[PDB]
Amino acid sequence: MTEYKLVVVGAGGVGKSALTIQLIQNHFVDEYDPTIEDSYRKQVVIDGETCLLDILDTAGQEEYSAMRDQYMRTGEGFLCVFAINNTKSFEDIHQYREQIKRVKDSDDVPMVLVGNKCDLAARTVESRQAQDLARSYGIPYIETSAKTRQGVEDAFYTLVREIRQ
Amino acid sequence: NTIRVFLPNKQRTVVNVRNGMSLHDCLMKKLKVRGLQPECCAVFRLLHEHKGKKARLDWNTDAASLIGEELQVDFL
Numbered sequence A: 001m002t003e004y005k006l007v008v009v010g011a012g013g014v015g016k017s018a019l020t021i022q023l024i025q026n027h028f029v030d031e032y033d034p035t036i037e038d039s040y041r042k043q044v045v046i047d048g049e050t051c052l053l054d055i056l057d058t059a060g061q062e063e064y065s066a067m068r069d070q071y072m073r074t075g076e077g078f079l080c081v082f083a084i085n086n087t088k089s090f091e092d093i094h095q096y097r098e099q100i101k102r103v104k105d106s107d108d109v110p111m112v113l114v115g116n117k118c119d120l121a122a123r124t125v126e127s128r129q130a131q132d133l134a135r136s137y138g139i140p141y142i143e144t145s146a147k148t149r150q151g152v153e154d155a156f157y158t159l160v161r162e163i164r165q
Numbered sequence B: 001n002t003i004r005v006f007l008p009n010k011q012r013t014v015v016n017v018r019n020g021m022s023l024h025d026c027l028m029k030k031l032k033v034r035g036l037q038p039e040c041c042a043v044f045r046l047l048h049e050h051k052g053k054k055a056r057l058d059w060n061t062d063a064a065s066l067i068g069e070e071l072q073v074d075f076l
C-alpha cells in the first residue's frame, strides 16, 4: 500500500500534536506537552484506498528549528497550522510556507492551512483573513478543533488528496 | 537535558527528562498514544562503539543517566 509522508508545522501551542493524536488515537490531549519531534505511522482508508500515513509532527517555535531542514525535503505534504485565537501564530504561517518553498523547490507543494481551536470563542483570526492567505498561496484552508474533532479528518484527508494530485 | 528514543515501526519521539522518573514514566505516555504496551517491549541504549550496537535497559532504570544519548524500543 501507498505511503503518504505528512508534516505538521506552525507556531508553538497551536495544536499540532493534539491534531495528530486526535487523528491517530481518537483522544484529545488536554495537557500542553511541547514537541521536539514526533513521528507517527498509521494505516487508514481514504476514499477507498488503504494507505499509510507517515506523519512528522514538528516543534512549534518552542523552538527547535535546527531539526527539520531536509525533514521537509522528505515531506510530501504539509499541514500549516495556526490557532484562531492566536493572531501571532497566523502571522507566523508565512515563515513556514517560505521555509517549505525553500527546502523543496516549487510554489505548488501539497499544502493545507489549518486554523485550529475553532471550538474556542476568543477568535482573533477571522475565517476571511485565513481564506485570503490560503487563496494567495493557492491552497485550501480548513478550520479544525482537535478537542471536538471538527475538521480533523478533513484536514488530513484533504492534505492526502492534494498529494494524490 | 532530554532523550531521543526510536520507537517500534519507524517512529521517533524525543523526551524532556525531569526527576524521580524511570524510563517507564518518561516513555509510557509515548507508547500508549501509539497503541503500544510498556510490558510488551524492551528498551535499549545505542552505542556505535562496536558499530550500531545495543545496550539493554530495565524499565525501572533512571531517566537522568541517559540525558544526552539515544534509545530504541522493541517488542519483547
Ligand SMILES: Nc1nc2c(ncn2[C@@H]2O[C@H](COP(=O)(O)OP(=O)(O)O)[C@@H](O)[C@H]2O)c(=O)[nH]1
Binding pocket: A010, A011, A012, A013, A014, A015, A016, A017, A018, A019, A029, A030, A031, A032, A033, A034, A035, A060, A116, A117, A118, A119, A120, A144, A145, A146, A147, A148
Ligand atoms: N480548546 C482547544 N484546545 C486545544 C486544541 N488543540 C490543542 N489545544 C490545547 O492547546 C495546547 C497546545 O497543544 P499542542 O498540540 O501541544 O500544541 P503544539 O505545540 O502545536 O503541538 C494543549 O493544551 C492542547 O490541549 C483545540 O482544538 N481546542
Ligand SMILES: [Mg+2]
Binding pocket: A013, A016, A017, A033, A034, A035, A058, A059, A060
Ligand atoms: Mg507540540
